[PDB]
Design a protein around this nucleic acid. Structure first.
Ligand SMILES: [Mg+2]
Ligand SMILES: [Mg+2]
Ligand SMILES: [Mg+2]
Ligand SMILES: [Mg+2]
Ligand SMILES: [Mg+2]
Ligand SMILES: [Mg+2]
Ligand SMILES: [Mg+2]
Ligand SMILES: [Mg+2]
Ligand SMILES: [Mg+2]
Ligand SMILES: [Mg+2]
Ligand SMILES: [Mg+2]
Ligand SMILES: [Mg+2]
Ligand SMILES: [Mg+2]
Ligand SMILES: [Mg+2]
Ligand SMILES: [Mg+2]
Ligand SMILES: [Mg+2]
Ligand SMILES: [Mg+2]
Ligand SMILES: [Mg+2]
Ligand SMILES: [Mg+2]
Ligand SMILES: [Mg+2]
Ligand SMILES: [Mg+2]
Ligand SMILES: [Mg+2]
Ligand SMILES: [Mg+2]
Ligand SMILES: [Mg+2]
Ligand SMILES: [Mg+2]
Ligand SMILES: [Mg+2]
Ligand SMILES: [Mg+2]
Ligand SMILES: [Mg+2]
Ligand SMILES: [Mg+2]
Ligand SMILES: [Mg+2]
Ligand SMILES: [Mg+2]
Ligand SMILES: [Mg+2]
Ligand SMILES: [Mg+2]
Ligand SMILES: [Mg+2]
Ligand SMILES: [Mg+2]
Lengths: 233, 121, 52, 252
RNA sequence: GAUGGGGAAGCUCCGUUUCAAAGGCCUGAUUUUAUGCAGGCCACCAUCGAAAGGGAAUCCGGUUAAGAUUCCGGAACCUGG
RNA sequence: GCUUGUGACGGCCCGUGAAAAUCCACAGGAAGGAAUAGUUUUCAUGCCAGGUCGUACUGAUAACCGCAGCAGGUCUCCAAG
RNA sequence: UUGACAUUGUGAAGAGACAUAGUUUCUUUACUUAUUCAAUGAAGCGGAGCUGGAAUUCAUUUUCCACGUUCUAGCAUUCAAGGUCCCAUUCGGGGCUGAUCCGGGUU
């Protein structure tokens, strides 16, 4: 009201300098950015073979929540924890004259790619989590087949890092359980089943199913409205 | 939530932390001592018969003066080596590739007097 | 021109030492008139939007 | 045998343009938002001679849609545009001399200058003092627009291709005899080093396919193959006829 | 003619703002304190290349065997502080 | 009158006859500013400092290039009766 | 320069063989991510919606265009004035709206 004034402002071509807007759509990203974006794009436009593409079919967040929840209990040894263990047995064992077995059998998550393979190969593994990233995808592509053929149940789970946390590495690639405290055997059988249902059961049909071949939306719409009009007037 | 809001179309190199050097072994064990001190700056008197004239009549002291040394430095090392005050210092490179200061003393001083205090004559 | 007092570099009208006075006069008139015939363009075509 | 003249010009030693005095390069506006959704005003601010150029240029200045400031363009002046004239550039812009409009929006028979081969290439066709192109119809699906260029050729380009309404200024410049060698001289002095021209037939054989002989003569057919090789192509390259063009010309 | 680059077995050739995450000013925020963050800009992208092109500012008198718009005398002017 | 400088004009062009550093001005109005006393250094006067390298002479029928103190060659300013 | 092979992928119609089920090969004509070219201090692209309205309604919308600038050699910049909400009211300052939504494919 006072001696204050409503002016508006005509931003309509040929007048008023354009205001500052959000151009985040338009910014000229560094090459390294443009690469990793378009790589993900190129990797979709191409029809991708069924032995890739059987990834992307990842776990769902809930079942995996339950599965990290388990695998957590069986983490490997901490630096200290084993120092502590050693300074137990070393002192103890060597004197009290226990047969290097004043230490309790350890139940832990098995890890490292080569380790877990021999485990699957030996039908000793009992539920294998496989990562969904893993950039030379080859390290891992043969694992669904393996677990299938060794009758080992498995799951493709989101996060090589998230696997890495439960083992104290940055990244892991795979995590597996072979052992289990009987107090958890029950949880796992239930866990196993869901997983088998989502993967190792569905495997054979997934092996028939190619991937990608997906248009981007500027040209999705292009034909969702070309094919909308042409056929049905 | 969601994304940034860049109003500029240009993407620029993030202004990231420039750490300063805090070494681990030294550069040279012992720093160099002063490479142009007052004694090295002003090398000899110039007692050419025609130079001496400039001292009796000029209130001007004439020195062979290190080529490495500028007027500022000639002025200081004279003022300092000799207690005297300096008015202005003209300079020149001789044909034998040695530098010559024409040093004019302020009226408070007599150069001709000061010339044969340093000793030459 | 930097060795010299500012009055040697202007005259006392708007756009002093920059445009030639008649040249200012023009853009005063033109400014005025055009900002007027603007109002006339406004309310006339405002009328049109109601009388159609 | 020596490298002949016409192969030497490729390395551009003494043969590069005499660029020093030129106003700048003449180009339409960038194909920005304004011009392809609406129009945008400018003022010609000066129409000025370009060295080595038949036709005058028009310095035309515009506001900047995105920053407070003037931004200036170098236009080839179409005939009859004048200082202080308002120039309108854009899709939704009117059919006057001097405006730039996308060939799509002008009725056939329109006469434009400096027209783009592809939209936004900032203008390629007909720029020499006196030329223009003529829209000779459009096919609205795949928006094309058929034009006839100065050469006589018809070519069909995008409707979005811009062109400026009119003919280029300075027409007729070639109706006037140079008269003396000097005016030629001073002409090329501001173009490039192509003048005068030694007849290859007056050279020794090291110098040219035409060189030597005890009388001056081309000594073999002077119509050279398209498939000839550098150092051979001097004469009438690829000539599909030869001799005094009798009868009317004019493309059908 | 360097530089991100692209050629070339290679000595090197190309490119000069070019398919590059290209850089620095004004002050504020410090009253642990010397300078981190706070804005807002400006995206200009090396450098060499003129003792006849551009260009801040000095003159007269006097003086030397030989220097002088350079020294002496007097009188000015410019740039930075 | 001579040389030169300058100016208001006029002839000529299918020729219309550099660039950049740098300096100033204006539009703008962020912001900062008095009465118990503020603003002002584009007004005057006043203080300090201005480095480095070149600077002699010849420039020609003997100081340069022509085997040389060669009748050759080698860019320019000043100009009495 | 002309051909083949390699770079070389995705649909659709049509020819071609086990001899008239589709693995395979070419003529056509589509597709766009490889490759290619133009542009720009990667600025407004594609998609939906608002409003207007031509349009004629065979139950109601089945659509199609638009959807801030053209007498004049002016002026157009300080996240914008306005409106509204916060800081705990200081001077300053902040959000939102003004300037619709969705997809981050610069075109
Ligand atoms: Mg444990
Ligand atoms: Mg005395
Ligand atoms: Mg000197
Ligand atoms: Mg005045
Ligand atoms: Mg050139
Ligand atoms: Mg010639
Ligand atoms: Mg000839
Ligand atoms: Mg000829
Ligand atoms: Mg001959
Ligand atoms: Mg021949
Ligand atoms: Mg020959
Ligand atoms: Mg011959
Ligand atoms: Mg003949
Ligand atoms: Mg180079
Ligand atoms: Mg230089
Ligand atoms: Mg110079
Ligand atoms: Mg000069
Ligand atoms: Mg004298
Ligand atoms: Mg002397
Ligand atoms: Mg002399
Ligand atoms: Mg003096
Ligand atoms: Mg004095
Ligand atoms: Mg001063
Ligand atoms: Mg003369
Ligand atoms: Mg002129
Ligand atoms: Mg000025
Ligand atoms: Mg402020
Ligand atoms: Mg002053
Ligand atoms: Mg300094
Ligand atoms: Mg001399
Ligand atoms: Mg002599
Ligand atoms: Mg000699
Ligand atoms: Mg001689
Ligand atoms: Mg082929
Ligand atoms: Mg763009």
């Amino acid at each position: 009201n006072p001696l204050t004034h409503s002016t508006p402002k005509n931003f309509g071509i040929g007048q008023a300098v354009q205001p500052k807007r959000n151009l985040s759509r338009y910014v000229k990203w560094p090459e390294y950015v443009r690469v990793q974006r378009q790589k993900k794009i190129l990797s979709i436009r191409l029809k991708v073979p069924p032995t890739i593409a059987q990834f992307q079919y990842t776990l769902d967040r809930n079942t995996a929540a339950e599965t990290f929840k388990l695998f957590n209990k069986y983490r490997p040894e901490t630096a200290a924890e084993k120092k502590e263990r050693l300074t137990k047995e070393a002192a103890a064992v060597a004197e009290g004259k226990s047969k290097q077995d004043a230490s309790p059998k350890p139940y832990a998550v098995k890890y490292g790619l080569n380790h877990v393979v021999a485990l699957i190969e030996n039908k000793k593994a009992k539920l294998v989590l496989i990562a969904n990233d893993v950039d030379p995808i080859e390290l891992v592509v043969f694992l669904p087949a393996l677990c299938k053929k060794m009758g080992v149940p498995y799951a493709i789970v989101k996060g090589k890092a998230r696997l890495g946390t439960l083992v104290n590495q940055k990244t892991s690639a795979v995590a597996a359980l072979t052992e289990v405290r009987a107090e958890d055997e029950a949880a796992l059988a239930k866990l196993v089943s869901t997983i088998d249902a989502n993967f190792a059961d569905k495997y054979d049909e997934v092996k028939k199913h190619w991937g990608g071949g997906i248009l981007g939306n500027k040209a999705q719409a292009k034909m969702d409205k070309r094919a909308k009009n042409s056929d049905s007037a | 939530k969601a994304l940034k809001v860049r109003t500029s179309a240009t993407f620029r190199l993030p202004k990231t932390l420039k750490l300063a050097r805090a070494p681990k072994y030294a550069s040279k064990a012992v720093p160099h001592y002063n490479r142009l001190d007052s004694y090295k700056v002003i090398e000899q008197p110039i007692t050419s018969e025609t130079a001496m004239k400039k001292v009796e009549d000029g209130n001007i002291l004439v020195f062979q003066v290190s080529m490495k040394a500028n007027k500022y430095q000639i002025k200081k090392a004279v003022k300092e080596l000799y207690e005297v005050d300096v008015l202005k210092v003209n300079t020149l490179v001789r044909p034998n590739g040695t530098k010559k200061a024409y040093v004019r003393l302020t009226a408070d001083y007599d150069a001709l007097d000061i010339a044969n205090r340093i000793g030459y004559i | 021109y930097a060795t010299v007092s500012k009055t040697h570099k202007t005259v006392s009208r708007a756009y002093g030492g920059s445009r030639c006075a008649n040249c200012v006069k023009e853009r005063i008139i033109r400014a005025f008139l055009i900002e007027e015939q603007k109002i006339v363009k406004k309310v006339v075509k405002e009328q049109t939007e109601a009388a159609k | 045998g020596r490298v002949i003249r016409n192969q030497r010009k490729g390395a551009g030693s003494i043969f590069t343009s005499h660029t020093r005095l030129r106003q700048g390069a003449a180009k339409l506006r960038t194909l920005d938002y304004a011009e392809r959704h609406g129009y945008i005003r400018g003022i010609v601010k000066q129409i000025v001679h370009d060295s080595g150029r038949g036709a005058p240029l028009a310095k035309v200045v515009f506001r900047d849609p995105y920053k407070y400031r003037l931004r200036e363009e170098i236009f080839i002046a179409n005939e009859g545009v004048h200082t202080g004239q308002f120039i309108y550039a854009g899709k939704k812009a009117s059919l006057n001399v001097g405006n730039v409009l996308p060939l799509g929006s002008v009725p056939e028979g329109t006469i434009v200058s400096n027209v783009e081969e592809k939209p936004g290439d900032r203008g390629a066709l007909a720029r020499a003092s006196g030329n223009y192109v003529i829209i000779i119809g459009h096919n609205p699906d795949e928006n094309k627009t058929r034009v006839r260029l100065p050469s006589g050729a018809k070519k069909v380009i995008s409707s979005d291709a811009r062109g400026v309404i009119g003919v280029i200024a300075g027409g007729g410049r070639v109706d006037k005899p140079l008269l003396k060698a000097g005016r030629a001289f001073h002409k090329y002095r501001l173009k490039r080093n192509s003048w005068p021209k030694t007849r290859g037939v007056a050279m020794n054989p090291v110098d040219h396919p035409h060189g030597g002989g005890n009388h001056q003569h081309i000594g073999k057919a002077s119509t050279i193959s398209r498939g000839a090789v550098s150092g051979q192509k001097a004469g009438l390259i690829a000539a599909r006829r030869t001799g005094l063009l009798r009868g009317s010309q004019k493309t059908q």
